[PDB]
Every structure is written in C-alpha cells, then in structure tokens.
Amino acid sequence: GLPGDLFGLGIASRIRTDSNSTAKAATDFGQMVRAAPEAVFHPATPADIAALVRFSATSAAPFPVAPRGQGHSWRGQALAPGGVVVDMGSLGRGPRINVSAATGAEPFVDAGGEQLWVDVLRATLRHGLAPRVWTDYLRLTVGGTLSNAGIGGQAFRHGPQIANVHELDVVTGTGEMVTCSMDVNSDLFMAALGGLGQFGVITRARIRLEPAPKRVRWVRLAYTDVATFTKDQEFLISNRTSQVGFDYVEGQVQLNRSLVEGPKSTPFFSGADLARLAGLASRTGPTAIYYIEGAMYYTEDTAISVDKKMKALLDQLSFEPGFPFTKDVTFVQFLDRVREEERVLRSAGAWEVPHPWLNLFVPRSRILDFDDGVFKALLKDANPAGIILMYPMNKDRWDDRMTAMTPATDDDDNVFYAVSFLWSALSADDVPQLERWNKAVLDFCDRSGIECKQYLPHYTSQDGWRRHFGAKWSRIAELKARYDPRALLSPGQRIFPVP
Template sequence: MAGRCLIAFLIMASCLSVFVSVSVSGQLPGDLFALGVASRLRVDGNWTARASSDFGRIVTAAPEAVLHPATPADIAELLWADVLRATLEHGLAPRVWTDYLRITVAGTLSNAGIGGHALRRGPQIANVLELDVITGRGDMVTCSRDKDPDLFFAALGGLGQFGIITRARIGLEPAPRRVRWARLVYSDVVTFTRDQELLISKQDGEASFDYVEGQVQLNRTLTDGPKSTPFFSDADITRLAGLASESTSGVIYFIEVAIYYNESTITSVDQKLEAILEQLSFEKGFVFTKDVSYVQFLDRVREEERALRSIGMWEVPHPWLNFFVPRSRILDFDAGVLKGVFAGANPVGVILMYPMNKHTWDDRMTAVTSDDDVFYAVGLLRSAVAAGDVVRLEKENEAVLAFCNNEGFGCKQYLPHYTSQDGWQRHFGAKWNKVVELKAKYDPHGILSPGQKIFSPMKTII
C-alpha cells in the first residue's frame, strides 16, 4: 500500500505470568528446560500471588509459576501505548487501535483487538504481517501468511493456546496530527443502526470517517451518574437527559466518529464533516464536536481512567461482558436486552454497540465472529461500585446470555469465558476440530493458558 511502512517490534517484558503451568506431577516439561527458561521461573507464593488478579477484580487464580524474562529473546510484553510513542517518532502509526492503549500487544493479538478503526481495516489481528511464537513444544518459530501459516493464523485470536507471541510485525501508515471528533445523538435505534451501517459501508476514497463506534446511554446513567465527562459539559448532559426522558424507553444512542487531518487540510475537514453529516439522521441540534491532537484522541480512555482513579472508581470489580450480535438480530437485542433485561437497571459504566464488516476478518484466524456479513460488537462494560453489585451484575450478564441463547441470536462472546469444554466447543463451532488439532500439534502437553479451561489438563491433548 502506498505510503505504508513496516516496522518490526521486538516485544520485551518485565514480567509475564499465567501462561506457563507446571505439569500435573509438579515437574517442568522438558521442553521448557530445553528452552532455557526454567531458571527464571518463580514458584514461591510471593510471586504467584502478585500475578493472581487482573483488571476484572472478580476472580483470582494463582499461576503455578511466574516467568521473568531476562533478554530480548525471552518471552515478552509491550503495551500499545509504547508502540504509539515509538512509531510517532518516525511520523508513523499502526492502522487499527483498541479504545484503551494500556493493554499488551500480545494480549490483544491473542483476542482480536477491536475498536472504531476496524470498520474498513478489520481488527488488529487482520493487520499483522509476521509473528515470532514460542510454541508449547519449546520451538521458536517465525511465521506469517506464507511461512508456517497454520501457526500464524492459530496464534491470531488464539487465546494463548498454541504459543507465546514474542514479536509482532504490523503495518504502519503516516500518522495524522489532528482529529475532528464528534458524537451524534439518536433517540431511535432503527435510525442509529441504519446510519452506523451506512458509515461502515463506505469505501476508502469515499467521503467517510476514519473511526466509527456507538454507545447506548440509559437515562438513569445521565441523570444519576457523574455530571461532566471528558466529552460532554454539564449543560450538554442536561440536554441529553432531557432528550432521553422524552423517549418512552429512556434510552438514547451516540454514534462516535472521527476524521483525521493535518493542519494544512483544516478547511477540507470541515467540508468533509459537513458532507458526511448531511447523509445522516441524528437528532437535529444534537451533534457535539471536539478538535484534539491524534495522541489525545487515541489515549482518550486514559483521561477517563485518571478521572475514575481520582474518585476511587477505577480499581473496582468489572463484570464485563462482550459479544458479537449478528446484524439481523440487533433490533431484537435492543428490545430484549437494553429495554428488557436492563429495564430499571442503573448501570455505572459504558455500553458499546457498533457494527463491523465480517469480510475484514480472515476466517483462518482462531478468532470467532458471528455469522452475518455485518455484526455488532456489544460491550456491557459495567463497574461494580456498591455492595452486592458484583453478584447482581453477574446475574444480569447471565440473563443476557440466556436470553440471547434462548432466542437463537447466534451471538459469539468476545474475550470469551466458559467453564466447560462443551461451552468452548459451541463457541468455536465449525473451528473446534481445527483448534483441537492445532493444540495437539503446538502444545501437546497442554501447558499454555490452562486457566481458560478450553482443554482438560494433559489427557485430551497427548
């Protein structure tokens, strides 16, 4: 692609946990000794306890060993924020971002890496050119679409089951300097989804946004939640709450969009924004815009994180549920979940709902999507802030999943969690046999990411 450059990142780590388990007998598999990492494994309680919880703050699971890599060739970790910093020094940036940058490259590539940039380019895993992977057999393999493709595609969205990613080569492009960032408000789900689908159907070269996401806002979140936010002023929130209270369901929706530009193209960005807005049917007068630097836009959740940390609302349990809903069932989902299961709920947090094009995902990857050509990423990103919230929110999540299953929506969990192999088998569907085959090939002892409970320890693999 013209103007596109490539940079290979060696991902280096200070600490990597969870992925390596000792065998049932308490002995390290011989492959790990061969790899020379055994001397850097810590098994004492001080180390394993420190690596036993995460952002969710709901489950604790002490790993059996914690690995401390010591050299660049060791197993590694890099955060996306570091990638942004390093690439901007060359005037370049990756093409697809997650909403939050303080998560690791390898961790997101093991899931998918989704966000509002995926509309034409697909998830982060669709933008990877090459990986270095240490398999469960202890082999260090450089793989790509052409070289050891089965390991390459297995590792992308592979939930850490087939190998540990230590290097990723990803596509970059010239970084813009400025972002025109807007939120458009809707009180009607049909118009909201129709406009979102129109926006993601635009091709490169057409007047289109560089980023498209959507959020659902329940009235009570507006009236009872924190007032001003990094995007909306107090006065904006009052107007939005007024709009929500006029709608029978109390639910309103935002499409969040962005156009990238440089100072020299400031006039044309205004024209471009106007031309696209003319095609949309948001509530008249309910368009809110901001002009920010590229880094401010990409790191926007960091600002929210700081605000939440300052009031003690960041380090709380997060019973989050993410899944993909086929386009053909999104209106049923809206009626049954947002206006059904959640009727009367008072969530603290964010509900995301935005469409993606299935053709931008490569079906050879382990990552699973739902079936329609267009499907919605729905993120119920709620925080437990009061006594009893964790139990209540988890029950609501279960009710949502049960409702979707009973109605036969064909939803697929993103960042999936199942407690039985049956659940995983249903999750992977037609990919299940391939997943089993690749696990036996690349991690025959079942030592990688056993906490996912996809495979029973050892016996089903060998």
C-alpha cells in the same frame, strides 16, 4: 509444588517465588478470580520463555505456564495456579520496537509481544507512521490483543488487529521458537491469531503501518431511536470508497437512569451538554440515548477545511437536530482518550473494582430484536456503572481461517455488531446483579434463536468452547495436540483438559 530441578536451571535466576511477587500475578482486571501461581518468571529474552516451556514439557510433572501481559482480562485467563506466570513485561528490559521505513519497501514495525500499543504508537510516530487498527485502550500488550483479535473503531475499514499482522515469533508449547506468516508455518500463524495463547506465546509481531495523521475531529451524535442509530452506523461503515467519511466509527448505549442519575460531567461532556441530553432522554417519557462516535483524521488541513468536510458528512445523517458534540484533538490525544477516563475513574476509586464484563458479536439481522429484549426489556430500569458499546463491523475485513470467531449467517450478511457490556461493580456487592444480567442476556439470545458469538469468550466446559468454535473446532483440537501436546499454555482459558 514445582519440580526441584527447575531451581537448578540457568533460567532459575529469573524465577521469583516471594509472596509479594506471586500476589502481583494472583488476580486480574476482573477482580473476581483469585489464584496465586507457584512462581512468577521474569524472562530477559524470548529464549528464556522457550527454556521454561521446554523444561515443563519434558518433565515428569508438567506444570502450567501462563504469559501475563497487563492482566486486562477478567475471567482468570492469565492465572496459573499450580504453575508459573510469565511476566511478559520483563522482555522489555531494553529496546524491543524496531520500525523499518526505508524507501523502496512497504513500512512495518517489529514489536515484542510484551510491548504496549501506546509504546508502539510513540515509536512509529517518530517516523510519521502508525498501525491502522487500535483497541480503545492503549495499555494492552501486542500479544494479549493479537491472541483475541483486537477490535476498535477502524476495524470496519481495515479489519481487526489480527488482520494487520505480517508475521509472528511464537514459543510453542513444546518450547520450539517458530517464525510464522501467511507463507511460512501458516498453520501456526493462523492458529495463534485469535488463538487465546493456546498454541504458543507470541514474543514478536510485525505490524502493518500507514502514514500517521496529526489531528482528529471527534464527534458524538445523539439518537433516541435504535432503528435510526443502527441505519446511520451501517451507512457510515458502508461507503468506504467515498471521500466523505469517518476513519473511526463506534457507538454507545446510555440507559435512561445512567443519564439522569449519572455524573455532573464526563471527560467528553460538560455539565451543560449532560443537562441537555437528560432533557432529550425524557421529552416524551424515559428513553435510552444511542450515541454514534465518529472521528475524522487530518494532517495539514486548515480548521475551516475540516469544518467543511465534517459538515458535508454530518449533513447526510439523521441524529437529533442540535445534538452533535465535537472535539478537535491531536492523533495521540484521540488514540489515548481512555487514559483520561481512567485518570478520572481512579481519582473516584471507580477503576480498581470488579469488572464482570460481557462482549457479544450479534448478527445485523437480529440487532433490533436484541435491542428490544436487552435494552428495552431487561435493562430499561437498570442503572449500571460503566459503559455499553455498540457498533457494526464488516465480515469481509476478517480472515475466517484465523481462530477468532464472528457470527455465522445463512444469507452471508457482511455486517455484524459488537455489543460490549463494560459494567463495573462500584461495590463488590453489586457483582451478583451484573452477573445475573450477563446470564439473562445469553438466555434471551438462546430463547430468541439469536446466534451470537462471545468476543473475549469464557466457558468453563468443553461443550461451551465446542459451540463457540463451531466448524473450526476439529482443526483447533488438531493444532492444539501438535503445538501444546501437554496442554500447559494459558490454562485459565479452560478450553483444554490436561492429558
């Protein structure tokens, strides 16, 4: 398949073509799309990636090049059939994380694009520092999350991970190695952030740091009314100057059947907690339960001072009386919480299964309309495995010059919701029902005039991508022609046909 001359290059020592190597890069976390590459490239350095891209870009028969982080995508975005998958992890041979915490300057961490957020955390904590914004799952690459946005419970306060980047090193689709920031090569910098790997491979990101907390008081608050739940989440993300507040705000939607016919316990909830929650979800007939998840960071504070701070905050809220659930953990245990959930799921054989996931950004003005059509109509009697996340964010912390898309509103409302259907098919036979629900959600939004934006989007036609990027589409197409003229990079995104 690949050109013969590729195997004569100095980088050919890092090209793996054995079935065992290529199979490891043929599927992703979704477990639905299978497309083996011709080879897997294991670069020792970012210059090796530039040499591979340059070879393809100057060849008679250009071939696709797709960087692969952890493969935590579910629609074949990291696959390169007919091409080469770049195993980014190879760049991590030796030391790839440098923390600059010298007195008389703003501290930062330089991390390879292949580096996992869990490894960045480990390195910065040794200096009493940490990045400000985290995804829920730390075994994701820096380059992988920055190519999307990187959202989590702190984004309402500091913006997505793409809003917490000083500069990048990018290997463009021509094989050029560019350093970019707000002040130098800003067109590439803004394009690459939420850019879905279309303009180049991120090989380095300089991440913003803040003093690290030591411990976290972590709560889940149960609500039976979506209007009360949303009013409280919006209150919690809207008093950011007040000393009484959470550092992290998320939420979860638990469908009635998912509680009643669910597990005996979870890593967060005991059997007794779950028995009480099932009672709450059926007191006046069957209801879903909406949980607010809040976390309060602290350092040297005594147990009794934290109790008082949490009480002052909880005392302002309207969750069901007697339904606060509290944990007190280290900062690392809090940020790495999903690793424990993964351990439990893998032991049950419920992790390495299909994940036909769907992530939406919904305008605040339509969130109760969304709830009515999706959770109260379409999914009221559904019992999907997995989780459903629901939480609001602030548009004022997102930079709309970056590629990443947020909902557009006529009244420029600052609040929008992230709604994530993270459902899993315990059996691959459950996939069609989940995909039918995904399409039904999108169809409901279309019929209702609810102008959502998919997050981690996937479209198989340029029409879908033109609607997704809206006002930014013309600039995106122009930057694409400049930075990846042959449309070699991450072709599994399906945004640009090969010219």
